[model samples]
Target: VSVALHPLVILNISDHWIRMRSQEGRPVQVIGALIGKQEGRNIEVMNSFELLSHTVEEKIIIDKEYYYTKEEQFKQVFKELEFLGWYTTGGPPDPSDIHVHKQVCEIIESPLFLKLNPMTKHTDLPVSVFESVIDIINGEATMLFAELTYTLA
Candidate 1:
């Protein structure tokens, strides 16, 4: 009999949040995990599924169709995906948005510029917040199917 070994793929299955720093003070690589971040929301620091992949790689691959669809959560995932060099479409504060909305209305935006916001791919944002934002963007897309019901054990 031949035994087949399944490739060990470490996934960031954290339901709340995650961080890249290590208590051991050693450099770590981020492998398969989402950074769960969103706009205008407090970041999340908590993370689960450790003791698995000690490091995550700089590049990660994600699919828009396979991931969850909660808008904010999608935004979180999208931002991280964008950072990792995955091919993604839409958003990140364009001149058009500025011209059509705030600028035309003659309104001053928040003291923090769009790029300055923690969610615009900042180290300051927590992993939980990152995940939440990912969900948000997913909700905005009408083309994707939204999954709302939670599976109970």
Candidate 2:
């Protein structure tokens, strides 16, 4: 599957990253609705928002109360977007990331993982998007990430 990202998604993530840097480099995370119609085997991420959530140490928590509040606001503002996935400040998926992804799966099955790394200034791109696949070996579930092709719309 590929991702169709809107230009605003990059803007929102960058703004959040900049703000986090000013806050003594506190971990930054956001959740937003992904807008677009699903095409056969592909998903188009047309829009996103910088959602408000609390960070405890390395884990980002989305409380039910706060989620409902922000979700309502999102609906009022962007009626067309649906719950797509989440974005966080990091380079790649660590163990904590796997846990967070599991939590997100409760809301949106097979959600996308968006990572923003400030160090990307040295690379050709500043962000990476991934989708996880379940691998069953020895009757255990393993999460494997596959890089998704994306384009700025």
Candidate 3:
């Protein structure tokens, strides 16, 4: 599998869950585009036994046939990335957003570059894009990923 090494604005699964990690130790992180869907058929009592008497839980319903389309619910995500900036230079973040910059670097140090070493990887730490994608889903602006702006160093 070709792993993607783009710095992205990831969408949150919930208030609790977030992005995936890049295997590389340098800087590039993986982007999450779609959400996972749960699929299953419900169980229903077909035969009402005479000994037990015919009984039905009115609150319960079952479907032997059920399916969900995993289409991209919201488009225009990567088309307009203003918050993270449009033109991406191949370096660190701008000095304005540099408060916890060192902490971010420290957090990403020595991470197993997945694009390099697929066997070993690091934790998807800090959950960076939680705020970005969450807001977008909640009617915020668009964003993009800088896939080509990473080095294996």
Instruction: Find the candidate with the highest TM-score and give its number.
Output: 2
Residues 84-137, candidate 3, lDDT per residue (tens digit)? Answer: 111111234444224223322333332111111122345533333322232255
Error of 1 at 73 (Å): 13
Candidate 3 lDDT score relative to the true structure: 0.23
Candidate 1, position 107, lDDT? 22
Worst 10-residue lDDT window, candidate 3: 44-53
Backbone atom clashes (below 3 Å) for every candidate: 35, 0, 7
**Candidate 1 runs further than 4 Å off:** 1-30, 34-42, 48-60, 69-153
> On residues 42-134, what C-alpha lDDT tens digit does candidate 1 reach at each position?
432122122121112432233333333433455654544211111111237555333333321222222111111112356545433111223
Pairwise TM-score winner, candidates 2 and 3: 2
**Over the full model, what C-alpha lDDT does candidate 1 score relative to the true structure?**
0.27
Question: Could you say which candidate leads in lDDT?
Answer: 2
TM-score per model over all chains: 0.16, 0.63, 0.15
Off by over 4 Å in 3: 1-9, 13-93, 110-153
